[PDB]
Structures are given as structure tokens and as C-alpha cells.
Amino acid sequence: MFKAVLFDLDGVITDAAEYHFRAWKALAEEIGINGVDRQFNEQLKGVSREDSLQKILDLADKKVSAEEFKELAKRKNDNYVKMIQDVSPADVYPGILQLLKDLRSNKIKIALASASKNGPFLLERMNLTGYFDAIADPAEVAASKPAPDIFIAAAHAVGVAPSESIGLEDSQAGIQAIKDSGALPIGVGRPEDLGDDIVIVPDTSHYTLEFLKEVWLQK
Ligand SMILES: [Mg+2]
């Protein structure tokens, strides 16, 4: 049987993207720039804070000094950090808490494989810290998803090979990273978005220990 499950945060455990989008939209509103909507925001995922700000400024050809740029990046982050103070156990996706309990009770290791720079805080706010054996630090990852590095790191941080692990992801890049690490992917979403060559469930209520064991046995 598999020995570990490697979780992404966003789109699996919780909607982590939303508060970043909110904070960017608020910043843009404050300075009179229109166009920070959800399709635009897809262009900010995985992008640095400063490169993200520059994209927003570019929507209006808005010119700013280095000092004003620094203030704006700071303000968005301040607002974001304020917003995430309100994260709670209610922000946990359906099925995930029970899955975590069942994995733990079966002595299956649990690791986070997320780019989130606020992963540990967010798991604390959701009261999930005690279920996690390790969190892979994204600051120590040389290459982001779809590179496998962060999944390999998450497996290693719990003392297993990725080949002993299942990875859970909602993104095409994350599924590729899981494949390339040697772990077994189980996607959440649509085959239209994630491909027809992996096991996919339509939402996180389908991620149960019994389903993961079935999948493992049938691979
Ligand atoms: Mg994800």
C-alpha cells in the first residue's frame, strides 16, 4: 500500500488563490486601474509579487517611482495578510478533514507540496497542523511545478520515496509534477483540464481513504 499522500494546498485543501486575487483587486481599485478580473489573475499565479504588480500597472501604462512601487507591493501584501487572519476550519474543502483523520489513523504519512509562502500559517488557521508530518518549504525548491522538485521534497521530508506516494492536485502543472516525481497522481476536476490518462475525481468529497487504496491497487 502507499506510505504517504502529498497534498497541494490551493484547490485541494482550500481556496488559497481567492484572498490573493481579492488583495490585488483592492489595490487596483485604490489606484484607479480597471481590468483585474479572474482571467487576468490567472496571469499572476506562480508569478512574483513584484512581477504581478508590474502586470497590473501595465494594464493602464501607469508609471511609478521605485519608492511608490515598493509602497504598493507592501500594501497589497499587508491587505492579504490581514485578510488571511479570518481563515478558519470552515475554509477546508469537503472530504479533506476526514481523509486526513483516516490517513493518520492508518499511519500513512501526510505532507504539503505547495508553493504557498503562507502554508504553515494557513494550516494552523484551519486547525490542520497536527495532521501534517511535514511541509515542503517552497523557498528551498529550485524549480516550480510542473517540475517535480516540490513533490520529491515533500516525500523526502517524511522519509519516503515518491514512488511510495500518492499526490493530490487540481492543476495540469501539478499533475505533471506528481507524474515526474514518481508518485501516483489523482486529480480533482475535469478530464478536459487535466487529461484522460490519470484518475480524476470531480470534487474533493471523492478523495476518501477507500478510494485512494482502490486506485493504488489498480495502478
Ligand atoms: Mg492546486
UniProtKB/Swiss-Prot annotation:
Effect ascribed to mutating residue 46 to P: 100'000-fold decrease in catalytic efficiency
pH dependence: Optimum pH is around 7. Relatively stable in solution within the pH range of 5-9.5.
Sequence positions that bind Mg(2+): 8, 10, 170
E.C. designation(s): 5.4.2.6
Highest taxon, organism lineage: Bacteria
Reported function: Catalyzes the interconversion of D-glucose 1-phosphate (G1P) and D-glucose 6-phosphate (G6P), forming beta-D-glucose 1,6-(bis)phosphate (beta-G16P) as an intermediate. The beta-phosphoglucomutase (Beta-PGM) acts on the beta-C(1) anomer of G1P. Glucose or lactose are used in preference to maltose, which is only utilized after glucose or lactose has been exhausted. It plays a key role in the regulation of the flow of carbohydrate intermediates in glycolysis and the formation of the sugar nucleotide UDP-glucose.
Co-factor binding details: Binds 1 magnesium ion per subunit.
Site (Important for catalytic activity and assists the phosphoryl transfer reaction to Asp8 by balancing charge and orienting the reacting groups) location in chain: 114, 145
Other comment: The catalysis proceeds via a phosphoenzyme formed by reaction of an active-site nucleophile with the cofactor glucose 1,6-diphosphate (G1,6-diP). The phosphorylated mutase binds either G1P or G6P and transfers the phosphoryl group to the C(6)OH or C(1)OH, respectively.
Outcome when changing residue 20 to Q: 8-fold reduction in the conversion of beta-G1P to G6P in the presence of beta-G1,6bisP
Chemical reaction(s) catalysed: beta-D-glucose 1-phosphate = beta-D-glucose 6-phosphate
GO MF term list: beta-phosphoglucomutase activity; magnesium ion binding
GO process annotations (BP): carbohydrate metabolic process
UniProt-recorded name of the protein: Beta-phosphoglucomutase
Recorded GO CC terms: cytoplasm
Species of provenance: Lactococcus lactis subsp. lactis (strain IL1403)
Effect of residue 20 to N: 300-fold reduction in the conversion of beta-G1P to G6P in the presence of beta-G1,6bisP
Subunit-level organization: Monomer.
Mechanisms controlling activity: Activated by phosphorylation. Competitively inhibited by alpha-D-galactose-1-phosphate.
